[PDB]
Design a protein around this ligand. Structure first.
Ligand SMILES: *C1=C(SCCO)C(=O)c2ccccc2C1=O
Ligand SMILES: *C1=C(SCCO)C(=O)c2ccccc2C1=O
Ligand SMILES: [Ca+2]
Ligand SMILES: [Ca+2]
Ligand SMILES: [Ca+2]
Ligand SMILES: [Ca+2]
Lengths: 89, 92
């Protein structure tokens, strides 16, 4: 794979490393989303140490209202992060 | 860096490998977009050889109509590709 192709696959893989833990294997519940952020975005985003933040992040990401973050919603999160990083530089 | 953080950085890296080649250093013109697809998406998309094909890709991606693909528009392209890829496997 090229660098870009590897990045695409990594996005899918990381989503599933977390979505597949509990409940529906194709969505991130609050606890899965928290762990993804704390373990995999520790250099980019402040660590989540409060359940209120979990609740508010999920509210922001959960566009279809099912209480969880699906792949589409995760990709919108990735786009937000990547845009923020781009602006940073 | 986690794998996710490395992937994010790779997106920014690749965009800039191509956007700074010609003209506006912050956007992909058609030639730069063709080169990006042909060299970085050679396993996921058919090689571009015809003008009409790169014209159509740019038309599809160029949400703001300025004739080039900026970073936001590139990120939307990446999301399209990633979503399509993920649908080839169990995804529900
Ligand atoms: C991206 C980010 S994202 C910050 C939340 O919007 C970042 O914090 C960072 C820090 C240091 C080097 C690189 C980066 C990013 O690419
Ligand atoms: C990703 C892609 S790119 C999007 C194609 O519409 C792909 O073509 C593909 C084909 C076969 C297996 C896996 C994948 C992808 O992960
Ligand atoms: Ca789950
Ligand atoms: Ca949802
Ligand atoms: Ca350019
Ligand atoms: Ca544009």
């Amino acid at each position: 794979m090229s660098e870009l192709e590897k990045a695409v696959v990594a996005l899918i893989d990381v989503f599933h490393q977390y979505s597949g833990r509990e409940g529906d294997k194709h969505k991130l519940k609050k606890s899965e989303l928290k762990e993804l952020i704390n373990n995999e975005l520790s250099h980019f985003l402040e660590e989540i140490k409060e359940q209120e933040v979990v609740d508010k992040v999920m509210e922001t990401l959960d566009s279809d209202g099912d209480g969880e973050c699906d792949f589409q919603e995760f990709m919108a999160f990735v786009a937000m992060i990547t845009t923020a990083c781009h602006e940073f530089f």
